[PDB]
Structure 1
Amino acid sequence: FSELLDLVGGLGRFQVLQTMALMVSIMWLCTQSMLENFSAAVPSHRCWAPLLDNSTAVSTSLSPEALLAISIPPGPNQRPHQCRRFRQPQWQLLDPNATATSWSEADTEPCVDGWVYDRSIFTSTIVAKWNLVCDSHALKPMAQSIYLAGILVGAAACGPASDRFGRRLVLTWSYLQMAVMGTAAAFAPAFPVYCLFRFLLAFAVAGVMMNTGTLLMEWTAARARPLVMTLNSLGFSFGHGLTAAVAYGVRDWTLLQLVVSVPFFLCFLYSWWLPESARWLIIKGKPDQALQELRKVARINGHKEAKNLTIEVLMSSVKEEVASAKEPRSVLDLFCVPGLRFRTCISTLCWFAFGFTFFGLALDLQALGSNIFLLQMFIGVVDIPAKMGALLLLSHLGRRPTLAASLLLAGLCILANTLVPHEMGALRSALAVLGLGGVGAAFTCITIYSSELFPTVLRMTAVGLGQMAARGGAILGPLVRLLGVHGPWLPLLVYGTVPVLSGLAALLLPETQSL
């Protein structure tokens, strides 16, 4: 196949522009996933009460602090209660002789008249729109889990459709679906409808993610392929900073979702000027069209040797890859070789731990640091050197020590974040950023490592099991926060424990770096 690329250019203008065009789309795709740190930010909130809020009433000399003491009981955080109010104004709390036990729980009622939300940071959020608070607290992580389950289902559906219809066609319509469904969610009338449209948006996110990487590799010479995939991975690192920058300017959830959805109408349009893969076209017995794509690429690269692309040269080079079709295989085969049985388990575990920890932590930055814009920016900025240093280390020290060290350090940083006292918010922010950086480095390490642990017959089946494990763990990520009602440290303890246990397990894997 690489002879056709050499007659067409395996690295050059076309590959450069293709890499740029796909990197930008991956940045915006990353913004789509990270959006609910801001679109679904929780404002500080309290019950609606007549004295505080019915401004049509008779004015008085009492200042808002006294009215807040008189109207709403204190809560766990040494702050006003977010879900209860006094049944009648408690004037007896105003005197200096008052005490904390001067009232009883029977004197308090829930927010019958609704909530009042802080508008200083955000104009609106889905939490404030649909009151995803108090008894409905679980609905935010439920929405995030529904999005990630959409990604799981979409990745399941993508493969067969990509093989049946082609990488570029499915990528094109995935772009269109992302644009439509992102626009539709921004105007949703109700919470279930918003969840439906976020699920259908993730369904297309999965296809974009898969077909972008596939369409890059199938047009890139093996010499440049690793660098190209590395740049594809850095697109998300820049997507984090892009999310912080865009969300800083747009403080309204509708406008934010709409703004991050519009770009995909442009991605849809310029996806038509891309060529379909010639490998896929020849494999499907379509040399008449593969030739057209090949000479399109050669024309872009300014390469004259399309004159030598007599159609037979296609039918005598790529044709015989179809020999691989004689033996389809399944996930269950991985565990039928006793030498691979344990290897498979402790690799899939690392994939699961990566996805679980990353989407446990990165989707509630509001719990990890005071300022979420700067914190998002930093989990973007640190991710870059983390990934590239992972590449450097595994190119020098090998795969096993790099994966083990990254996972262990990430887990131990996240555990420390619980141990550092709450007042030292700067150090907690730094440690959270370092933990997520270790998780990203572990993503790099496991992606490269899993492509080497298994025999050629099974490499892609093993990697598929790994990727599906990562998506399944990402689904469980958000739901662990429901443990937070028992204590703020418990979800973080779980998120820190999982990577430690998986990084200890990674010490048992065999090495694959060339000697």
Structure 2
Amino acid sequence: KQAFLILCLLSAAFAPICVGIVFLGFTPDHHCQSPGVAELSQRCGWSPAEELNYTVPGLGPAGEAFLGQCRRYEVDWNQSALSCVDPLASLATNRSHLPLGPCQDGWVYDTPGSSIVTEFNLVCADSWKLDLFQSCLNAGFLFGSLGVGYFADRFGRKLCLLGTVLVNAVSGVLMAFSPNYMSMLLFRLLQGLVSKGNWMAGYTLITEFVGSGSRRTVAIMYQMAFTVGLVALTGLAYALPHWRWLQLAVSLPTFLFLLYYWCVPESPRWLLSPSFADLFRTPRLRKRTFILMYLWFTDSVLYQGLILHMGATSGNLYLDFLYSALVEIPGAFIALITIDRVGRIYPMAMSNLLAGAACLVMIFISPDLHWLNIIIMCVGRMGITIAIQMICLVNAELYPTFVRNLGVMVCSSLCDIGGIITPFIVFRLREVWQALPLILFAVLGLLAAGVTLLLP
């Protein structure tokens, strides 16, 4: 189906943009680059795993990995007077007493490729800027979910969608060529503006075309196109290690889509009072609005939360991610079936409870049981996927046609606000205690579970 394919491609191409940070911006293990260590290593013959025993701050209670990652012994490594057995025994009565400094001269990264982290040195004190990368995108989303309606009111639909697709394709391509963090964040923001606009527009068009009976099914099929997008993201990120190659390979298809769309007649897609206060005027409607806002926020937070957490902590990222993407499909069938069989409130509650429990269990798990961790992670991802499917319908059902679209605009803006807050909770906060983010996700999931039961 051409008329179906041309929109599902525009859904599948959105997933590499939203989640791509997990592959464009991994943080590999690193230590302070150390001038003269290469010379002393050449003299003494230290192998890669051996040099880190003698040339980096040692681990201890409470890890001390921060010292290894962000400090270095200020030793005169050029000295041939140093012992090749262990130079630090020649220099101090105890290693603890050596002079220590910051990595003034550079960084060494254990990867054959590169990521934005490795390429702009977003390590140690700079590491917040990495969360600033995903935050700028979700800020683009927030400005999109509100400004796109006004724009499309003031600018013609065909012109609007042509513009936003061209700008998405270009800005995504140009991001690969950004030479500095400022320009990269600006392209990330422009793409944040236009990507959600395109995604919502394509969704609207596909649901406007398909008959009202099949429309509901086609919505879930359009979601599953996102999962196929995640699978493609994994494949490309495995074939193309350097983040620029990946960014081009991700962006190009949306460019070629315009070279296709212009070459053949596709005009029907574009050719074919509400007030914010009225969403709150009455206490029951107001309460339901608050609940839907909360649940959209919670599921956004948990979805990006689990994906970024996995990106930050998984030991076999590519298969830990592949086996997680391919779980949304069974999740989609479980959703569609259960929606038809017994409704939507009980599934949305149970699936949020399942997500909360899965997050909580990941606190207690012994992490060497990688096979258990990946299973619980999959159970969580399935849960939050089913909940997102359910709430996409429930947010239509609980608002009347007089305000339904404004309710969607609100809820989506709440999702984008959660997308803005989630990164700093996942990374910039995780350095306090690795349980913390999972405690938050557990609490959020359990509350979303309990709160859900109040909806009619």
Rate the CA distance shift 1:219–1:165 in 2: closer, same or farther, 3 A: farther
CA contact (8 A) 1:215 1:277 kept: no
Cα 1:94–1:364 shift into 2, 3 Å: same
Name the counterpart of 2:373.
Answer: 428
C-alpha spacing 1:399/1:67, structure 2 compared with 1 (3 Å):
closer
- The 2-side partners of 1:350 and 1:182 are apart by 30
Q: 1:103 aligns with which of 89, 95, 102?
A: 95
Which residue pairs with 2:244 in the alignment?
254
Shift in Å, 1:277? 5.0
2:445 corresponds, among 499, 504, 509, to 499
Give the equivalent residue in structure 2 for 1:85: 72
Matched-pair contact (CA < 8 Å) for 1:412–1:496? yes
Q: 1:149-189: per-residue Cα shift (whole Å, max 9, x none)?
A: 11111222211223344444322222211111112111111
Aligned 8 A contact 2:332 2:385 in 1: yes
The residue matched to 1:336 in structure 2 has which SS? coil
Cα distance in structure 2, aligned partners of 1:435 and 1:372: 17
- Matched residues in 1 for 2:2 and 2:42: separation? 67
In the alignment, is the contact (CA less than 8 A) between 1:46 and 1:116 conserved in 2? yes
Aligned residue runs from structure 1 range 1-20, under 5 A: 16-20=1-5
Normalised TM-score (structure 2): 0.91
* 1:231 alignment partner AA: M
Return the alpha-carbon distance in structure 1 between the equivalents of residues 171 and 280 of structure 2: 39
In 1, are the aligned partners of 2:10 and 2:202 still within 8 Å (CA)?
Answer: no
Aligned to 1:468: 413
* 1: CA distance, partners of 2:138 / 2:300: 10
Residue 349 of structure 2: which of 391, 398, 404 is its match? 404
With the length of structure 1 as denominator, give the TM-score of the two structures.
Answer: 0.81
When structure 1 is superposed on structure 2, of 21-30 and 269-278 the one drifting more is 269-278
Corresponding residue for residue 360 of structure 2: 415
Residues 46-57 of structure 1 aligned to structure 2 (within 5 Å): 46-54=31-39
Answer whether contact 2:320 2:374 (CA < 8 A) is retained. Answer: yes
Q: Which of 236, 240, 256 in structure 2 is aligned with 1:266?
A: 256
The match for 2:116 among 118, 121, 126 is 126
Deviation at 1:142, TM superposition (A): 1.0
Distance in 2, Cα, partners of 1:137 & 1:101: 35
Give the match for residue 391 of structure 2.
446
The SS at the match of 2:451 is helix
Q: Deviation at 1:270?
A: 2.8
From 422, 425, 430, give the equivalent of 1:477: 422
Matched residue, 1:74 = 58
One-letter code aligned to 2:94: S
Contact 2:220/2:336, CA 8 A, preserved across alignment: no
The amino acid that maps onto 1:118 is D
Aligned to 1:331: 276
Q: Is 1:188 aligned to residue 178 of structure 2? A: yes
Does residue 342 (structure 1) correspond to residue 287 (structure 2)? The answer is yes
Cα distance between partner residues in 1 of 2:424 and 2:89: 45
Which residue of 2 is the match for residue 9 of structure 1? none
How far the C-alpha of 1:368 sits from its partner, in A, is: 4.4
* Distance (Å, rounded) in 2 between the aligned partners of 1:473 and 1:227: 28
1:487 aligns with 2:450: no
**What secondary structure is seen at the aligned counterpart in 2 of 1:109?**
strand
Unaligned runs of 5+ in 1: 1-15, 282-289, 291-327, 511-515
Contact persistence 2:89–2:95 (CA under 8 A): no
Change (3 A) 1:161 1:101: farther
| Residues 356 and 475, structure 1, Cα contact 8 Å, conserved in 2 | no
Amino acid in the other structure paired with 2:306:
L
The residue that corresponds to 1:314 in the other structure is none
Cα separation, 1, equivalents of 2:424 and 2:50: 39
**Does the aligned pair in 2 maintain the 1:93–1:102 contact within 8 Å?**
no
Task: Name which of 305, 309, 316 aligns with 1:360.
Answer: 305
Equivalent-residue separation in structure 2 for 1:105 and 1:393 (angstroms): 64
Compared CA separation, residues 68 and 329, structure 1 to 2 (3 A): same
- Structure 1 residues 504, 104: CA separation in 2 closer, same or farther (over 3 Å shift)? same
1:90-169 matches, cutoff 5 A: 94=86, 102-104=94-96, 107-120=99-112, 123-169=113-159
Write the deviation string for residues 320-379 of structure 1: whole angstroms up to 9, x where unpaired.
xxxxxxxx2222211101231211111111111111111122134233421111122122
Query: Whole-Å Cα distance in 2 between the matches of residues 93 and 504 of structure 1?
Result: 61
- Aligned counterparts of 1:351 and 1:206: Cα–Cα separation in 2: 16
83-92 or 470-479, which deviates more:
83-92
Gaps spanning 5+ residues in structure 2: where? Answer: none
SS in structure 2 at match of 1:362: helix
Change (3 A) 1:176 1:41: same
Which residue is equivalent to 1:286? Answer: none
Summarize the Cα distance change of 1:161–1:69 in structure 2 as closer, same or farther, 3 Å threshold. Answer: same
Letter in 1 for 2:18: S
Contact 1:173–1:268, Cα closer than 8 Å, also in 2: no
Q: Secondary structure at the match of 2:178?
A: coil
3-state SS, counterpart of residue 112 of structure 1: coil
Shift of 1:37: 0.9
Whole-Å separation in 1 of the counterparts to 2:42 and 2:209:
74
Amino acid at match of 2:95: W
In the alignment, the residues of structure 2 paired with residue 66 and residue 30 of structure 1 have an alpha-carbon distance, to the nearest angstrom, of: 41
Spell out, residue by residue over 1:23-42, the C-alpha distance to the aligned partner (whole angstroms, 9 max, x if none).
12211221122221111111
Q: Larger radius of gyration, structure 1 or 2?
A: 1
Q: What code does the residue aligned with 2:35 have?
A: P
What displacement does 1:64 show?
A: 4.7
- Please tell me the residue identity of whatever aligns with 2:216: P
